[PDB]
Amino acid sequence: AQNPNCNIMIFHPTKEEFNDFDKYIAYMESQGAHRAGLAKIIPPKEWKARETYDNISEILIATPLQQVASGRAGVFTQYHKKKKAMTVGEYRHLANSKKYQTPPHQNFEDLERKYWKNRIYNSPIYGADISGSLFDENTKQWNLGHLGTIQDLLEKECGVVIEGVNTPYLYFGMWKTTFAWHTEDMDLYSINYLHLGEPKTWYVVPPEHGQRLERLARELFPGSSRGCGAFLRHKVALISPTVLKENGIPFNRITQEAGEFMVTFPYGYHAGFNHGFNCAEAINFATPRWIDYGKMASQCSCGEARVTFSMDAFVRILQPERYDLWKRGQD
Ligand SMILES: O=C(O)CNC(=O)C(=O)O
Numbered sequence: 001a002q003n004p005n006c007n008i009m010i011f012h013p014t015k016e017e018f019n020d021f022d023k024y025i026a027y028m029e030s031q032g033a034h035r036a037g038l039a040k041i042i043p044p045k046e047w048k049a050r051e052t053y054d055n056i057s058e059i060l061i062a063t064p065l066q067q068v069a070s071g072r073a074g075v076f077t078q079y080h081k082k083k084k085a086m087t088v089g090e091y092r093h094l095a096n097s098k099k100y101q102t103p104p105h106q107n108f109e110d111l112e113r114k115y116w117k118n119r120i121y122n123s124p125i126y127g128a129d130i131s132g133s134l135f136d137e138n139t140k141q142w143n144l145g146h147l148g149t150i151q152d153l154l155e156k157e158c159g160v161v162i163e164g165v166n167t168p169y170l171y172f173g174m175w176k177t178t179f180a181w182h183t184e185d186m187d188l189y190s191i192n193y194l195h196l197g198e199p200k201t202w203y204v205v206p207p208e209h210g211q212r213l214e215r216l217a218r219e220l221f222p223g224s225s226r227g228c229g230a231f232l233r234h235k236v237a238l239i240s241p242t243v244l245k246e247n248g249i250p251f252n253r254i255t256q257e258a259g260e261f262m263v264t265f266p267y268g269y270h271a272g273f274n275h276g277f278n279c280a281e282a283i284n285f286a287t288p289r290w291i292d293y294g295k296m297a298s299q300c301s302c303g304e305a306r307v308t309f310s311m312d313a314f315v316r317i318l319q320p321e322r323y324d325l326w327k328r329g330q331d
Pocket residue numbers: 171178179190191192264270280282283
């Protein structure tokens with residue numbers, strides 16, 4: 001069995017190996033990368049996403065989100081308070097202000113310590129989930145707006161043509177902006193490219209151990225767990241590495257830097273934080289191996305998780321017994 005300890009693997013594809021996206025995902029899986037739940041892909045030195053980032057300041061962040069925490073430093077929830085629209089240039093200036101800027105630090109490990117000590121005492125503002133792309137249309141390799149769609153994959157594997165579309169999303173971050181513990185919708189893959197700026201630290205639980213994280217979460221968030229049998233779909237709960245280690249939960253960590261891709265694998269729980277002003281692009285995708293995870297994915301039906309238009313068909317075709325209840329949650 002490849003990668004039996006479920007370590008995060010780092011790949012360095014050549015320019016020739018960077019041509020065929022599906023083939024390279026399959027290769028990484030042949031080497032056991034999925035067992036970790038997360039992999040890093042460093043593009044060949046010949047590649048670039050676009051020519052420059054000098055002209056992005058006028059992108060609008062229509063609904064910046066202030067991430068307000070409740071709880072204790074290692075075990076907390078966050079809610080998202082909507083703020084007035086601002087441009088990427090305005091948001092960058094805000095991120096660099098004395099109130100929001102990254103503190104002085106020695107190295108990534110010192111910053112990670114400071115994050116977990118201090119996160120709850122601040123409310124950073126995240127420009128998340130903005131439909132759009134920063135890849136140049138002429139970038140032919142690993143262009144996250146030109147991937148095979150999940151609807152086409154389902155049709156290729158299962159024969160059923162379905163409605164829906166699959167487009168990327170931009171994330172503008174600042175120090176302490178946080179992504180809560182989650183798997184993807186329908187336990188899909190994700191791919192995330194860090195276009196510019198400061199790093200992003202990731203934590204991940206191997207897919208084979210995901211239910212251990214879920215059981216801990218039910219213990220640590222007992223009201224939320226009574227409210228919903230899949231409350232991590234709400235994407236609000238944070239648990240620190242220290243708390244995970246105290247509770248014996250298997251996990252790994254890695255820091256992504258600008259110019260690097262990360263891939264999350266089906267049912268790989270992940271969480272993390274941004275080091276300072278940055279911009280990432282991410283999208284969900286599927287492979288043949290995903291189908292069985294899609295069929296078994298948990299679902300929130302309490303009403304809180306509220307998701308895209310395109311998830312309807314995935315539930316309807318892969319999970320027909322759950323469909324009616326899930327859709328009640330959506331309406
Ligand atoms: O970058 C973020 O805030 C969150 N990203 C992801 O969860 C991802 O790419 O799957």
